[PDB]
Amino acid sequence: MPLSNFEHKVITECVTIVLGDAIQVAKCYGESVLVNAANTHLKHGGGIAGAINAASKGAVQKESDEYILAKGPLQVGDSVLLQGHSLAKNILHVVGPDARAKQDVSLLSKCYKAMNAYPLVVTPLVSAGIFGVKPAVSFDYLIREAKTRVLVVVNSQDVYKSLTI
Numbered sequence: 001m002p003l004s005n006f007e008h009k010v011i012t013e014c015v016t017i018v019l020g021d022a023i024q025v026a027k028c029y030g031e032s033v034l035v036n037a038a039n040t041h042l043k044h045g046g047g048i049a050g051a052i053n054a055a056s057k058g059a060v061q062k063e064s065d066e067y068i069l070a071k072g073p074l075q076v077g078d079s080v081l082l083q084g085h086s087l088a089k090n091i092l093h094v095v096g097p098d099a100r101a102k103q104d105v106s107l108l109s110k111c112y113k114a115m116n117a118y119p120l121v122v123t124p125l126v127s128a129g130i131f132g133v134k135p136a137v138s139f140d141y142l143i144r145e146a147k148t149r150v151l152v153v154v155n156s157q158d159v160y161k162s163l164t165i
């Protein structure tokens, strides 16, 4: 019962909202895929990406740099499955839209659809931090697309209360 370690609320038979650190939730499930909310160049400086990279001792950034050098940068809405680096079975790097740049928020549908390839996914709310989309809106796109087991982890009690009220 890994979720007994965290306040959580089951929303549907697919989606559960969890209050905590997504990295610590994923650590509890060896078969989970952890979602990174990334940018087009996989530069993991801050936000959840910085935290995931630090937890990997910088290995995530090294792997990402090699990928981007070989393939070129990603487009908004793209996703790439990369190594898990002992944090999870794999890390799925998704490029959410940046609302500050007035990018198309509906591209979150593409980000969240990519999660359905995996039986168990631990994800933050993509675009809801640096990229300026409201948590409740990011959640709307997630719940519309989710067809697999998804633990949506939010690290703010204010957003947790807002989504579970």
Ligand SMILES: Nc1ncnc2c1ncn2[C@@H]1O[C@H](COP(=O)(O)OP(=O)(O)O)[C@@H](O)[C@H]1O
Binding pocket: 020, 021, 022, 023, 037, 038, 046, 047, 048, 049, 051, 096, 124, 125, 126, 127, 128, 129, 130, 131, 132, 135, 153, 154, 155
């Ligand atoms: N370890 C974490 N676990 C869960 N949520 C996190 C974590 N770190 C940051 N967040 C929150 O996840 C959401 C997306 O964060 P962020 O890294 O800024 O991505 P984006 O650039 O897509 O907006 C934000 O609401 C953020 O505050």
